[PDB]
Design a protein around this ligand. Structure first.
Ligand SMILES: CC(C)(Sc1ccncc1-c1ccc(C#N)c2ccccc12)C(=O)O
Length: 421
């Protein structure tokens, strides 16, 4: 009774935590924009007017003819940008003009968020040890709620990034304490099931985010809505690494497990946080991510049970990488196929997360098990921090970030073939 109720509450918390993580692709979606031109803001056709007021692009994002030319002089967006509000009424990109010259700020915002996750885990470890895990979890709920509300009403971009950093600082503690509490009260034999249940809670959070963002098209309102439930969550909440590396034989397993954690984190947080490239419809992609993760993670658990631990992880990582590579390979015209491939890739990445979480426990003796799992978690968080950054390589071509996202998991899975069991 108590175990199931606690599991349900923590599943709800994880759903909302996934919402916090994945909100960025909605609250930071880049709308179609253009320099604010006077002649565009003898009237003629809007298409013709825009043709004589904005140079053509591969509709140029950030240029405008100095004087309306009827038919070099192109100049930057001196007066600002005009954002298309057909989908989103407001966004951080539209609010702070994170386009073109300052385009790197959005992926940099996502990197700051993930660095906040890393720092929050690092601090909450010793804090959760020093103070009760339940107390730290309650304080993390409170911090998540307040940081989300503040970042919703952030006046300037540095303030928004700072409060996203503190929000991540809090979510790291939330995740740490939720996982620890689930582990403590669950029988050692039932650990794979509990891990799968938590991952399924995250999958449900994907669709929850999709629905909330669909309803609330204002980034301020979206952030505030996703942050409010943590107020209620707070209300009703009431063997060192040196030795691990020293051992000679362990080095192979340690390196490969850490590489797998890093590959999962990098690929997921570099792809999951930018679904605009993956598919045309962000809401549909967000929904399908969870809709496929559910069966994907269930099948991952089934294969893990019957097909084995190592081959299941290898298959999941290879599937993710190959699907991402195909997505960047198949023609951009075939949008449906690319969206399906991206959904399959994210499902495989989630399955790989389940597999590695349930596998790294077995790979190492009980004395070093906690240290190995912690090292894997830290590597995953570092890869997450590096995830959004590689999207900056898209300036040369949008295919390069996806090529990196695909070749990382493929190589990690191939390396996963050397694991013992
Ligand atoms: C930081 C991560 C990647 S975890 C994490 C931290 C913060 N935000 C989300 C996740 C996360 C990402 C994908 C998941 C999936 N699928 C997932 C499932 C359950 C719990 C968290 C996640 C790690 O620990 O290395």
């Amino acid at each position: 009774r108590f175990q199931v109720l606690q599991t349900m509450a923590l599943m709800v918390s994880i759903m909302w935590l996934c919402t916090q993580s994945m909100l960025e692709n909605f609250s930071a979606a880049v709308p179609s924009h253009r320099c604010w031109a006077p002649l565009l803001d003898g009237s003629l056709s809007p298409e013709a007017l825009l043709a004589i007021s904005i140079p053509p692009g591969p509709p140029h994002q950030c240029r405008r003819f100095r004087q309306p030319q009827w038919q070099a002089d192109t100049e930057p967006c001196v007066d600002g940008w005009v954002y298309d509000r057909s989908i989103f009424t407001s966004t951080i990109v539209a609010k702070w003009n994170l386009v073109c010259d300052s385009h790197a700020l959005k992926p940099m915002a996502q990197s700051i968020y993930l660095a906040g996750i890393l720092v929050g885990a690092a601090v909450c470890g010793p804090a959760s040890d020093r103070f009760g895990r339940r107390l730290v979890l309650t304080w993390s709920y409170l911090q998540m709620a307040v940081s989300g509300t503040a970042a919703a009403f952030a006046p300037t971009f540095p303030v928004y990034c700072l409060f996203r950093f503190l929000l991540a600082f809090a979510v790291a503690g939330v995740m740490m304490n939720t996982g620890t509490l689930l582990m403590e009260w669950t029988s050692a034999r039932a650990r794979p099931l509990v891990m799968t249940l938590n991952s399924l809670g995250f999958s449900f959070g994907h669709g929850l985010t999709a629905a909330v963002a669909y309803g609330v098209r204002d980034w301020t309102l979206l952030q505030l809505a996703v942050s409010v439930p943590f107020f209620l969550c707070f209300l009703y909440s009431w063997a060192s690494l040196g030795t691990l590396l020293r051992t000679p034989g362990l080095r192979l397993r340690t390196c490969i497990s850490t590489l797998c954690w890093f590959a999962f984190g990098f690929t997921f947080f570099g792809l999951a946080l930018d679904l605009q490239a993956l598919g045309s419809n962000i809401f549909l992609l967000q929904v399908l991510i969870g809709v496929v993760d559910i069966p994907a993670k269930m099948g991952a658990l089934l294969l893990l049970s019957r097909l084995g631990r190592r081959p299941t992880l290898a298959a999941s990582l290879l599937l993710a990488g190959l699907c991402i590579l195909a997505n960047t390979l198949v023609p951009h015209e075939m949008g449906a196929l690319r969206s399906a491939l991206a959904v399959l890739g994210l499902g495989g990445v989630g399955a790989a997360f389940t597999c590695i979480t349930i596998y790294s426990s077995e790979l190492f003796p009980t004395v070093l098990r906690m240290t190995a799992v912690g090292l894997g978690q830290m590597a995953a968080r570092g890869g997450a921090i590096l995830g959004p950054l590689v999207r900056l390589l898209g300036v040369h071509g949008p295919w390069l970030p996806l090529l990196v996202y695909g070749t990382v998991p493929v190589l990690s899975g191939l390396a996963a073939l050397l694991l013992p069991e």
